[PDB]
Amino acid sequence: SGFRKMAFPSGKVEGCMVQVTCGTTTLNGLWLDDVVYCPRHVICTSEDMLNPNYEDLLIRKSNHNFLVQAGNVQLRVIGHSMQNCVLKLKVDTANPKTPKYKFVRIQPGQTFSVLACYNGSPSGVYQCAMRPNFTIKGSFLNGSCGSVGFNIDYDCVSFCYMHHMELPTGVHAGTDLEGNFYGPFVDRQTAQAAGTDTTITVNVLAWLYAAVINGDRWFLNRFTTTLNDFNLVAMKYNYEPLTQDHVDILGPLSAQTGIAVLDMCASLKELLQNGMNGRTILGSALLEDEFTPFDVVRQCSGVT
């Protein structure tokens, strides 16, 4: 028992982290096979970031200008190319530690682990969610760009995120591994509206099931609700509308505990309306939305 904001073991991703330097700009790169993937803003100076013409900036760069270092060894760059907001530096050596991998585009509300890196060296790993407004509430300092987000299915690492920018609001934005931004962000130092965020309802419910599994049962009540009634409360509290697909996704957790999905929705409704009255659920004094139903089943079953 016990429930933690657990991250995937970062070992398979630690072996891919390299440092990429171009001019006076240094950030992190991801070495898979004979390709190093890094944010394209590695070619910009601090001044360039205000309004960069990346096509023009890259035109001034050659293979020898991209210095790629893995630990203490230099990688020879035999080709560079820009795909959306990332740079792909083809190196002459395939990474001997390349794990099985995929590049995936996660959906908003999905979770992933981030291995925060500085100068190609990993500093820590943490679990977080893609917010419904396509931002992440990470912990990133200058030089952390190129740090990646991922999920792990036994031996296959599914890379979903690459860190690029911190918005003036202190929240973070990045791309999938093909350089496409999650959300409406552009890689320019300008004010960018993140948009209204909502709470991931399916995730809060999944975490309520985890609390029941792990002993916290005080929030369970003698009530039930319908999707339409629950959704009226969800709108009032800026929670994502719950659909039948969210209910179906909660199926196994509903089976485990025997608490019908709509009955748990009625528990969430009373918590939204009445608060927690100074009590905790799984050590939290708020309603946690960074655990998916998949995460909850995985953590409570033991999936390695």
Ligand X SMILES: C[C@@H]1COc2ccc(Cl)cc2[C@@H]1C(=O)Nc1cncc2ccccc12
Cite the active site residues. 41, 145
Phi, psi of 31 (to 5 degrees): -95, 105
Residues 63 and 5: beta-carbon distance below 8 Å: no
Our finding on whether 156 is near a second copy (CB under 8 A) is: no
Q: Count the Cβ atoms, other than its own, within 10 Å of residue 63.
A: 13
Per CB under 8 A, which of residues 167..206 are in contact with a second copy? 170-172
Considering CB distances under 5 to 8 angstroms, the limit depending on partner class, which of a second copy, ligand X, none binds residue 164? ligand X
Binding site partner of 294, from ligand X, a second copy, none, Cβ cut-off 5-8 A by kind: none
Listed ranges 48-56, 60-68, 81-89, 131-139: which one lies at the site for a second copy (CB under 8 A): 131-139
Out of a second copy, ligand X, none, which partner does residue 189 contact, by CB within 5 to 8 A per kind? Answer: ligand X
Residue 188 Cβ, how far from ligand X at the closest point, in Å? 6
Residue 283 found at the interface with a second copy (CB under 8 A): yes
Strand duo 156-166 + 172-175: pairing: antiparallel
Cβ atoms of residues 247 and 268 within 8 Å:
no
Q: Which of 191, 183, 173, 195 is nearest to 41 (CA)?
A: 173
Q: How far is the CB of 84 from ligand X (least distance, A)?
A: 12
CA dist 173 and 149 (Å) reads 12
Amino acid (one-letter) located at 206: A
The residue nearest ligand X at its CB is: 189
- Cα–Cα distance for residue pair 234/268, rounded to 1 Å: 9
For residue 6, the partner it binds in ligand X, a second copy, none, with Cβ less than 5 to 8 A by kind, is a second copy
CB atoms within 10 A of CB 297: 17
> Under the rule (CB under 8 A), what is the footprint of a second copy?
1-11, 14-15, 115-119, 121-126, 128, 137-141, 143-144, 166, 170-172, 214-215, 275-276, 278, 280, 283-286, 298-304
